[PDB]
Design a binder for this molecule. Structure first.
Ligand code: HEM
Length: 151
């Protein structure tokens, strides 16, 4: 589990993200889609986007980026007790959207990359290690639910 100090580093940089949820959402999803094209194929809403410029110009993508980061924010703020927040997410992503745990690892990488780009001062090695731990916890718990339903 993460220590109180680790959660503090995670939430300190996350407070910086909340100042521009939409901007962060775009960078993260675009990074995910470009680095791992197979993830884009999972979104019927975004499959038509063929260039980074098109992705950046999509208000629909920006809207989803907010949805994603808002859900993640609520999870991170629950620190070591995010059971209630994960249930609906793990459920939909396993059976409805069919998102393998590996894709959650990909988006975690994208999140960490964008955080470093936008908040280097509050995202040094210690904060980076803490965020990695928080995102690993997120994936681990979702994975447990995935195994439960046989996905
Ligand atoms: C930080 C990790 C993620 C979070 C917090 C997150 C959160 C959400 C939320 C809140 C929704 C809308 C409600 C729902 O259906 O549950 C959603 C929908 C969806 N997510 Fe995620 N998601 C994450 C990662 C991913 C990844 C990695 C993929 C695909 C590779 C993905 C694919 C989808 C799809 C396809 C939908 C349905 C979109 C639609 O039809 O409008 N998500 N996600």
């Amino acid at each position: 589990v993460l220590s109180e100090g680790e959660w503090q580093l995670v939430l300190h940089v996350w407070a910086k993200v909340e100042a521009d949820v939409a901007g962060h959402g775009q960078d993260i999803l675009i990074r995910l889609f470009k680095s791992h094209p197979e993830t884009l194929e999972k979104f019927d809403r975004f499959k038509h986007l063929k260039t980074e410029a098109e992705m950046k110009a999509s208000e629909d993508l920006k809207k989803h980026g907010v949805t994603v980061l808002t859900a993640l924010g609520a999870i991170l703020k629950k620190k070591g007790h995010h059971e209630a927040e994960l249930k609906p997410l793990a459920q939909s992503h396993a059976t409805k959207h069919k998102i393998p745990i590996k894709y959650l690892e990909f988006i975690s990488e994208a999140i960490i990359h964008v955080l470093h780009s936008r908040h280097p001062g509050d995202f040094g090695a210690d904060a980076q290690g803490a965020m990695n731990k928080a995102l690993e916890l997120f994936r681990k718990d979702i994975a447990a639910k995935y195994k439960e339903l046989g996905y």
